Amino acid sequence: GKLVIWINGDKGYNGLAEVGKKFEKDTGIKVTVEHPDKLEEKFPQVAATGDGPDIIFWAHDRFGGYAQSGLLAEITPDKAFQDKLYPFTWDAVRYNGKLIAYPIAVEALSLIYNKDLLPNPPKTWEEIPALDKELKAKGKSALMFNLQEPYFTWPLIAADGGYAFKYENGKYDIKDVGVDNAGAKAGLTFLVDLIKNKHMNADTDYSIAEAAFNKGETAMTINGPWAWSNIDTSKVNYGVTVLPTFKGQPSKPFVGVLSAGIDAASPNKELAKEFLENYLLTDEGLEAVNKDKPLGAVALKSYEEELAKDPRIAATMENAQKGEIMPNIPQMSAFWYAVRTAVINAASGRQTVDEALKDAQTRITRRVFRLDMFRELTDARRYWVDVTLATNNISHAVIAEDKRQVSSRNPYCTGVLGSQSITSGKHYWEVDVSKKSAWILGVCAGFQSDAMYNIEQNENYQPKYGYWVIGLQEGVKYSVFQDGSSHTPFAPFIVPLSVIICPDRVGVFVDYEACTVSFFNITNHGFLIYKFSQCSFSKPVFPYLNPRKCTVPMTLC
Numbered sequence: 152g153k154l155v156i157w158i159n160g161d162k163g164y165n166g167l168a169e170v171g172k173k174f175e176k177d178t179g180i181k182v183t184v185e186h187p188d189k190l191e192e193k194f195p196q197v198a199a200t201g202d203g204p205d206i207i208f209w210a211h212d213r214f215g216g217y218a219q220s221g222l223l224a225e226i227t228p229d230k231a232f233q234d235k236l237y238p239f240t241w242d243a244v245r246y247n248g249k250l251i252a253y254p255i256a257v258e259a260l261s262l263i264y265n266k267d268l269l270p271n272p273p274k275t276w277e278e279i280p281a282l283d284k285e286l287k288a289k290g291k292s293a294l295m296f297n298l299q300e301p302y303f304t305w306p307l308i309a310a311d312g313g314y315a316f317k318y319e320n321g322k323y324d325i326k327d328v329g330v331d332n333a334g335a336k337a338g339l340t341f342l343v344d345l346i347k348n349k350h351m352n353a354d355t356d357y358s359i360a361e362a363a364f365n366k367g368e369t370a371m372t373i374n375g376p377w378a379w380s381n382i383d384t385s386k387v388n389y390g391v392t393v394l395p396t397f398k399g400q401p402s403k404p405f406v407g408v409l410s411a412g413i414d415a416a417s418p419n420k421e422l423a424k425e426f427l428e429n430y431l432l433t434d435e436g437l438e439a440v441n442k443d444k445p446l447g448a449v450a451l452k453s454y455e456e457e458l459a460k461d462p463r464i465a466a467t468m469e470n471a472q473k474g475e476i477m478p479n480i481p482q483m484s485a486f487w488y489a490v491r492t493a494v495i496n497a498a499s500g501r502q503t504v505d506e507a508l509k510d511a512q513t514r515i516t517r518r519v520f521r522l523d524m525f526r527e528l529t530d531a532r533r534y535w536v537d538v539t540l541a542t543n544n545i546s547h548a549v550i551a552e553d554k555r556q557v558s559s560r561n562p563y564c565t566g567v568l569g570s571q572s573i574t575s576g577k578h579y580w581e582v583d584v585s586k587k588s589a590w591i592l593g594v595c596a597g598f599q600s601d602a603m604y605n606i607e608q609n610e611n612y613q614p615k616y617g618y619w620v621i622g623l624q625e626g627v628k629y630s631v632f633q634d635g636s637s638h639t640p641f642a643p644f645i646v647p648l649s650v651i652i653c654p655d656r657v658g659v660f661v662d663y664e665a666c667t668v669s670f671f672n673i674t675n676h677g678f679l680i681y682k683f684s685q686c687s688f689s690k691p692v693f694p695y696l697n698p699r700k701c702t703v704p705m706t707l708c
């Protein structure tokens with residue numbers, strides 16, 4: 152019987168505590184609100200060890216990562232409760248068909264301006280440079296906001312067409328990432344120009360922007376609802392308006408639903424539900440918090456209706472309508488981290504915009520960072536790539552909707568390739584074969600259907616026909632599929648591979664420039680199993696995976 156809640160320092164924690172206090176009054180169990188630094192990164196660490204907060208408050212996008220990691224408990228709330236909050240907020244906090252958090256509030260960056268200093272807010276980004284030069288000649292600046300966090304710079308970047316993950320056919324494609332497109336390069340390019348024109352300074356952080364604006368030294372800032380409190384403290388005449396256009400288009404700011412998740416390890420899930428459902432998520436409760444620091448537009452229809460009266464909230468909503476509510480998938484933290492780095496590198500001059508985004512994009516797209524072993528092996532792992540299988544049909548093998556493993560069917564071609572292709576560089580990935588009777592693992596340059604008919608089913612894989620692969624048969628017989636003699640085209644030359652230990656996991660390493668494809672026995676200290684060398688790479692080449700009608704999954708990595 153206790154509750155520990157974690158919430159950001161930006162947010163109105165004290166207001167929340169007041170809610171905690173009333174909950175304690177009624178039920179006599181203590182509630183503690185803690186607002187620790189970088190709680191978003193800390194939470195997985197502590198929670199996993201068994202001691203983490205019972206309840207955590209953050210924007211929805213992370214929560215997928217948490218949920219996948221199994222740190223979040225599912226929530227059982229009744230149909231009638233669900234009705235009280237908007238269904239789109241619920242969707243934000245839905246992962247793999249399960250609700251993982253309670254939605255609380257909807258937060259969107261707004262353009263905030265000092266009315267006394269500036270009569271009319273800029274409709275366009277492009278006018279702002281002229282304005283700031285006008286303003287400098289009075290010891291003041293046009294615009295200051297946190298450049299360190301990509302949350303604040305994303306809206307401009309997305310304006311002309313930058314995007315994180317392509318959503319199509321009802322699903323986010325983690326591979327189709329638009330950080331490196333024309334639109335994104337255009338947006339970031341404008342910003343770097345502002346910095347090098349001395350209009351804005353690359354170091355400006357949250358505190359700097361906020362201090363400057365509150366002290367009326369800058370005409371504009373960019374921020375969410377939580378910030379309105381401090382500006383009220385400063386007695387500044389301010390408006391909250393729509394973000395300016397870039398290349399004639401709306402700034403598209405990612406929209407967050409502040410959400411309350413329940414630690415999977417919490418002994419007090421039962422208490423947590425009531426607190427959230429019956430105490431916080433009520434007119435009384437949100438008011439408490441909102442009076443401390445503004446929540447934005449709340450999820451609770453009851454109270455939000457009274458909030459919509461505030462013109463500032465309307466402005467928040469207008470910017471949200473122009474933007475996109477964040478994805479909640481696990482890759483969001485890669486996205487963010489990559490963009491965080493690209494922004495500062497470009498603004499500090501340590502990289503060109505075009506570099507920064509190619510860096511950031513490959514980082515997100517392929518090179519995901521998601522001893523006592525063979526040195527070559529550890530070397531190869533340095534180049535490790537994330538791989539998802541591409542569904543192209545039919546081969547009769549089943550693939551998990553995660554696109555990360557494949558097995559056969561009970562009911563003769565079952566063979567599958569990696570979604571992404573290879574034309575340059577070094578790629579490493581691992582495949583879990585454990586507990587499988589048979590399989591073929593290797594690098595496949597394509598089905599090459601119509602190239603010549605046969606290989607798919609009669610299982611002749613020969614480098615000459617573009618298959619560099621090794622195989623398991625009958626539980627303990629391992630083979631390399633080297634290419635055969637001229638007359639014998641149909642059958643591959645099969646070489647007994649001597650493996651001392653059945654590998655539960657195998658590592659495939661492609662150095663495209665080298666024309667080398669190497670196989671490592673992860674189970675057995677990463678020793679080399681086989682290496683195809685001097686192999687013709689005339690074509691893009693993809694990872695190959697064949698269950699070999701095993702009926703047991705081959706999982707990637």
Ligand SMILES: OC[C@H]1O[C@H](O[C@H]2[C@H](O)[C@@H](O)[C@@H](O)O[C@@H]2CO)[C@H](O)[C@@H](O)[C@@H]1O
Binds near residue numbers: 161210213375487
């Ligand atoms: O900056 C990357 C960051 O963006 C979002 O964080 C926001 C948060 O949603 C707001 O509520 C407020 O506190 O500002 C934050 C940025 O300073 C994402 O929610 C977060 O996961 C991501 O790291």
